[PDB]
Swiss-Prot record:
Name of this protein: Mgp-operon protein 3
Pfam families listed in its UniProt record: MGP3_C (PF19342), MgpC (PF05220)
Compositional bias ranges of the Polar residues kind: 155-183
Reported consequences of knocking out the gene: Probably essential, it was not disrupted in a global transposon mutagenesis study.
Membrane is among the record's keywords: yes
GO CC, any one term: plasma membrane
Keywords, in A-Z order: Cell adhesion, Cell membrane, Membrane, Signal, Transmembrane, Transmembrane helix
GO biological process: cell adhesion
Extent of Basic and acidic residues compositional bias: 140-151
Family annotation (InterPro entries): MGP3_C, MgpC
Region of interest (Disordered), ranges: 138-183, 200-233
UniProt KW Oxidoreductase keyword: no
Topology within the bilayer: Single-pass membrane protein
């Protein structure tokens, strides 16, 4: 379509021309049109084959989780709670203007709960969500029991070497390796039926009550409300932050001052992004909260059909290598055939249960996704005397120093496969948190053989891509990517459980298996997505300060200098996954290239695909890192963009460029210290381009051993003073910004100067002078948005002997009618031609056809959405041509 769709507010979408003007009467309330009540809002939208697909969600949604019986997850039918999310297909019913009509409506039903799933869900506990204001110390949790304290006990230390073989820990050199973190302090963990607090501990190693809900509601909540009162009063904020406004801003739903239960937050967050193919509509969660399910809706689905979501716990991904999946799964929980009521995701044969999804997109008939693996480990929930009582079972899985350099060798290294190994080591005088070595060294799950049947190991899901929160040195180095080998090349030692980025391309058949997994009766049915990969993607270490390397730096002491809008410098985040077809042609006989980009903290990730079979791009050499992923670090200008203010990402096929829009109005109203936020004005635009040698350019590039990449550039289009309406990327050379510098909409034209966009004030003024019409005015004597056209005098015909030629000959000779005017372009390479019309046997008229900022030509008959633009182009009559030859 020749128009740009601009979401005006949470309900209205307006169609805009390339001249940054709204099409008259195009403003449409899509919630009302979808026959949804006013509690609904637009979550996301996409165009598929000229139709508009809109995802809607209700602020009134109330979900319940009942442990007893069946159909455990349900909408709260009392009062106004049965408000499921919907996907609606709209069509434009008019040839003149925009008139949206609803074609299909798809309800997104709550997930089915099998018996095996419900045994995990009953004791499932979820960490309170990370906000803009969560500190590194907020995330820090008290260190758990050592490997020796768990297996041997409180007696002595010298018996490790002689008793480790009985507990299957042969040659394990780490009796003081941590088995996890305590759940009696720190960030709140809540059951599906429970609610998270609006309070965040400043120091989670001392404050907060962890999973101790009763301890929070009886003593600590009073302490928190006293220290951190919500604004009206003036509080202290010595011990807790009050992030209520930051929680509302990331989609946390409330009943006055109380957040709704966890399952409501999960349902509401899970219906945030959509992607459309010929057969399917796919719905995924947002990047603020972990999601446990996604919807695969068959476009053929009949009206008033409940569309069921598929659990990620039933969705087996290819993590790159089987060991990579084994690392994640072994740390999910304790799996043992001789234990009663010890149900977790591992013991019940489920896979990774949750992700922080960056987004979803479609290219051809393929779905592309990405996200971070949300941390998920086992925890001891028993009551009486357990050594790990109220402790989460988590440990570092960073590759050892003596590992062979080569991607496959590093990621399949056995270090920390089944249990703890890393911590603190000093060989001669060289210190490392990582083991120097890998019969063989034995790792084992942190459950002692005696308390095997009497143990209750359940599941937890973290709010970030970290598994282990334990306040020790290894945690910092794992989260920041600071573990390096002592070899000549000095390679980075990867984690296999912390900061794991996930991505893939999903086919129609893989979507069909997810749909049957979602509709399966009885026991769980599984889906395998084979064109997926994983990647250790830590946060930049330069987002932190004062780290000791040669007393160690832990989470409770780590100083954040993160410039990207987060108070923390340890948890990764991603946003705006967007795919795009490369406009650059491939060699004959090869399919058109396409890729995807996504923003992460401190850089852009590029995803690479082989379009020959819609697979991930790969290379034969296993020593090379999977070439379907490439990470490019941001410079200071990109790192300064507040990633929590991401509004939207668009791709332009002609330019081959992605445009990421950031809107500062998306910032919360108040701080964690209940202080009004004042830098909520303005916006920013990041432009992403591809870099490197692409596939199928010539015979030499039919195979690749180097991953194509991307480059994010804070383009020069930004403001700290205007309220943004929209950014129109007209061409590689120009962008139009619609903003309010008051209550009224203003048009600003930004011109691309050798990679850097700069405001062109004279062009802005030309474009904005439309006199209430849809397009910029036309003035004869001015070099305006249409350049300047000066017509030759009629005397040119006699002087050049063109009078001997006929009207029909002149009209059929482009080079001649180009000599009837002189053009002055308003911008370099702006083109103009004359359109000729016979008026009589001896005369014709000419009218210019002129290129605008979008690269398109406009003339007297031009329309947008079928509406005549009536620009005001002149007509010039030339007379005195021969009647016949
Ligand atoms: K002009």
């Amino acid at each position: 379509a020749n128009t740009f769709l601009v979401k005006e507010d949470s309900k209205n979408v307006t169609a805009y021309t390339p001249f940054a003007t709204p099409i008259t009467d195009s403003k449409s309330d899509l919630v009302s049109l979808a026959q949804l009540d006013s509690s609904y809002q637009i979550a996301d939208q996409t165009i598929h084959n000229t139709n508009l697909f809109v995802l809607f969600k209700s602020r009134d949604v109330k979900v319940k989780y009942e442990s007893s019986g069946s159909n455990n997850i349900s909408f709260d039918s009392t009062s106004q709670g049965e408000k499921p999310s919907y996907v609606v297909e709209f069509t434009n019913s008019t040839n003149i203007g925009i008139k949206w009509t609803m074609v299909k409506k798809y309800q997104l039903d709550v997930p089915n709960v099998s018996s095996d799933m419900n045994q995990v869900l009953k004791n499932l506990i979820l960490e309170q969500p990370l906000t803009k204001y969560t500190l590194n110390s907020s995330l820090a949790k008290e260190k758990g029991k050592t490997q020796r304290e768990v297996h041997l006990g409180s007696g002595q230390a010298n018996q490790w070497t002689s008793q480790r073989n009985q507990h299957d820990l042969n040659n394990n050199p780490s009796p003081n390796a941590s088995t996890g973190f305590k759940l009696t302090t720190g960030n709140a963990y809540r059951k599906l039926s429970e609610s998270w607090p609006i309070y965040e501990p400043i120091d989670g190693t001392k404050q907060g009550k962890g999973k101790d809900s009763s301890g929070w509601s009886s003593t600590e909540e009073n302490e928190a409300k006293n220290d951190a009162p919500s604004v009206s009063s003036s509080g202290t904020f010595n011990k807790y932050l009050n992030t209520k406004q930051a929680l509302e801003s990331i989609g946390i739903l409330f009943d006055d001052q109380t957040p709704r239960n966890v399952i409501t937050q999960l349902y509401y967050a899970s219906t945030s992004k959509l992607a459309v193919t010929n057969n399917h509509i796919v719905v995924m969660g947002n990047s603020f909260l972990p999601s446990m399910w996604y919807w695969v809706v068959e476009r053929s689905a009949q009206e008033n059909a409940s569309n069921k979501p598929t659990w990620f716990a039933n969705t087996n991904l290819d993590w790159g290598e089987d060991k990579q999946k084994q690392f994640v799964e072994n740390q999910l929980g304790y799996k043992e055939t001789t234990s009663t009521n010890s149900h977790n995701f591992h013991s019940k044969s489920f896979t990774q249960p949750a992700y922080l999804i960056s987004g979803i997109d479609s290219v051809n008939d393929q779905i592309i996704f990405s996200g971070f693996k949300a941390g998920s480990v086992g925890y001891d929930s028993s009551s009486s005397s357990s050594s790990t009582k109220d402790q989460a079972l988590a440990w570092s899985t960073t590759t050892s120093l003596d590992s062979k350099t080569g991607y496959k060798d590093l990621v399949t290294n056995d270090t920390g496969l089944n249990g703890p190994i890393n911590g603190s080591f000093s060989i001669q005088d060289t210190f490392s948190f990582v083991v120097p070595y890998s019969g063989p060294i034995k790792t084992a799950y942190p459950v002692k053989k005696d308390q095997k049947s009497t143990v209750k190991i359940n599941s937890l899901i973290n709010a970030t891509p970290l598994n282990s929160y334990g306040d020790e040195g290894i945690g910092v180095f794992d989260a920041l990517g600071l573990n390096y080998n002592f070899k000549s090349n000095q390679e980075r030692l990867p984690s296999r459980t912390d900061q794991i980025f996930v991505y893939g391309i999903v086919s129609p058949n893989e979507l069909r298996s997810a749909k049957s997994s979602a509709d399966s009766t009885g026991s769980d049915t599984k889906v395998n997505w084979s064109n997926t990969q994983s990647r250790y993607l830590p946060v930049p270490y330069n987002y932190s300060e004062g780290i000791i390397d040669a007393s160690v730096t832990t989470f409770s002491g780590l100083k954040s200098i993160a410039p990207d809008g987060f108070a923390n410098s340890i948890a990764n985040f991603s946003v705006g996954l967007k795919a795009g077809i490369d406009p650059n042609p491939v060699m004959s006989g090869k399919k058109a290239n396409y890729g995807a980009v996504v923003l992460t903290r401190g850089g852009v990730v590029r995803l690479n695909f082989n379009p020959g079979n819609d697979s991930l791009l790969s290379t034969t050499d296993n020593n090379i890192a999977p070439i379907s992923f490439s990470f490019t670090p941001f410079t200071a200008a990109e790192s300064a963009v507040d990633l929590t203010t991401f509004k939207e990402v668009t791709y332009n096929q002609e330019s081959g460029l992605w445009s990421y829009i950031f809107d500062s109005s998306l910032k919360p109203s108040h701080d964690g210290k209940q202080t009004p936020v004042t830098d909520n004005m303005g916006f920013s635009v990041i432009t992403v381009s591809r870099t490197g040698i692409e596939l199928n350019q010539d015979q030499a590039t039919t195979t690749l051993d180097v991953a194509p990449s991307a480059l994010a550039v804070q383009s020069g289009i930004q403001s700290t003073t205007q309220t943004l309406t929209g950014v129109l990327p007209l061409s590689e050379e120009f962008s139009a910004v619609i903003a309010k510098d008051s209550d009224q909409n203003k048009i600003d034209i930004y011109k691309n100067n050798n990679g850097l966009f700069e405001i062109d004030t004279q062009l802005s003024n030309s474009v904005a002078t439309n006199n209430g019409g849809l397009a910029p005015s036309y003035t004869e004597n001015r070099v305006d948005a249409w350049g300047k056209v000066e017509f030759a005098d009629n005397s040119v015909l006699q002087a050049r002997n063109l009078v001997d030629k006929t009207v029909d000959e002149i009209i059929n000779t482009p080079e001649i009618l180009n000599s009837f005017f002189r053009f002055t372009p308003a911008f370099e390479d702006q083109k103009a031609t004359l359109v000729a019309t016979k008026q009589s046997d001896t005369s014709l008229s000419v009218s210019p056809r002129i290129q605008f900022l979008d690269g398109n030509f406009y003339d007297l008959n031009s329309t947008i959405a079928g509406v005549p633009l009536n620009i005001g182009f002149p007509s010039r009559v030339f007379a005195g041509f021969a009647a016949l030859p």
